[PDB]
């Protein structure tokens, strides 16, 4: 079929929300009518084009689909199913392809709505972006301000365990049950003894979640972060940046799978921030996927001084 | 044991 974009007209354009914090899950859509002009056939297609600050998959991953993330079917105003939908995850493109619906009508009139999440990876600091979205070869113009929970957290010493998490990958189609989860390491950067991270696959309750951490289960890479204020709000971080020098290595015998559901790894002494990233597995009971992570150490002069923290995770499965 | 974090996406 044919791009015909040149006769898609889309109009009254919305955004249902500008400011949110992805970090609790703040989330948008978009919604729009769009009147066909010309003569189409089945099989013709129009796009739509997110810019750099947007996704149209948010934290669900579909890298286990062939990068592809399915779209509920586009309706005519009469109720009647106009177009099939997909999502590119690399172009960042949605993809209409009208069925046989046109091949009898003029005056093809629907409409659409469809979720918008941040893009971690192109807007990984809080701030305002543009956010202009392309319908049909038209621009719609936004600003979008993303005011992420601050990835830097813990107890308020100076010597204080501190450390967070986040998913952001959820394979929720292949049946693979995937996910990617970046954990920060002393985002403080303070200095601490003895220290030891605990990566849960649950929270409280074991049975409450469908996570799954085990050494078949999970696979652990770490990194020494360089420059700690170039690190993401967003929890985006590329295992391949120059700003992180990998040491997964150095941990082969530092990790440590001694409880059920729990990712032992022993940090030691340490100075620095680290990067954890995450790849595990959910199971199929159809629980929320809940994690922990904790961090506690001591005062590396004096070892004393103990403290503790946690930090919660949960998407849906 | 208990600050919190969470994330969204879409299952089209």
Known sequence: ?317 | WNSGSSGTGSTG
Do not use: C
Not at chain 1, 156 to 162: I, R
Not at chain 1, 213 to 222: N, Y
Not at chain 1, 230 to 252: C, H, I, R
């Open chain 1, 1 to 317: 079929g044919t791009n015909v974009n040149d006769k898609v007209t889309a109009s009254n354009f919305k955004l249902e929300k500008t400011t949110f914090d992805p970090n609790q899950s703040g989330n948008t859509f978009m919604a729009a009518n769009f009147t066909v002009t010309d003569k189409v056939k089945s099989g013709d297609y129009f796009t739509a084009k997110l810019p750099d600050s947007l996704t149209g998959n948010g934290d669900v991953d579909y890298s286990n689909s062939n990068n592809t993330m399915p779209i509920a079917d586009i309706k005519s105003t009469n109720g009647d199913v106009v177009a099939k939908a997909t999502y590119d995850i690399l172009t960042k493109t949605y993809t209409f392809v009208f069925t046989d619906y046109v091949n009898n009508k003029e005056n093809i009139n629907g409409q659409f709505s469809l979720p918008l999440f941040t893009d971690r990876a192109k807007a990984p600091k809080s701030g305002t972006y543009d956010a202009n979205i392309n319908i049909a070869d038209e621009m719609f113009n936004n600003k979008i301000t993303y005011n992420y929970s601050s990835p830097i957290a813990g107890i308020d010493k100076p010597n204080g365990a501190n450390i967070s998490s986040q998913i952001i990958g959820v394979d929720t189609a292949s049946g693979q049950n995937t996910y990617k989860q970046t954990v920060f390491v002393n985002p403080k950067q303070r200095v601490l003894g003895n220290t030891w991270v605990y990566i849960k696959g649950y929270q409280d309750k074991i049975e409450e979640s469908s996570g799954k951490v085990s050494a078949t289960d999970t696979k652990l890479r770490i990194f020494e972060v360089n420059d700690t204020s170039k690190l993401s709000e967003s929890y985006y971080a590329d295992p391949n940046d120059s700003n992180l020098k990998e040491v997964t290595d150095q941990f082969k015998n530092r990790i440590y799978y001694e409880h059920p559901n729990v990712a032992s790894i022993k940090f030691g002494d340490i100075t620095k921030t680290y990067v954890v990233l995450v790849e595990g597995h959910y199971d199929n009971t159809g629980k929320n996927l809940k994690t922990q992570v904790i961090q506690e150490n001591v005062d590396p002069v004096t070892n004393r001084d103990y403290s503790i923290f946690g930090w919660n995770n949960e998407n849906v499965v």
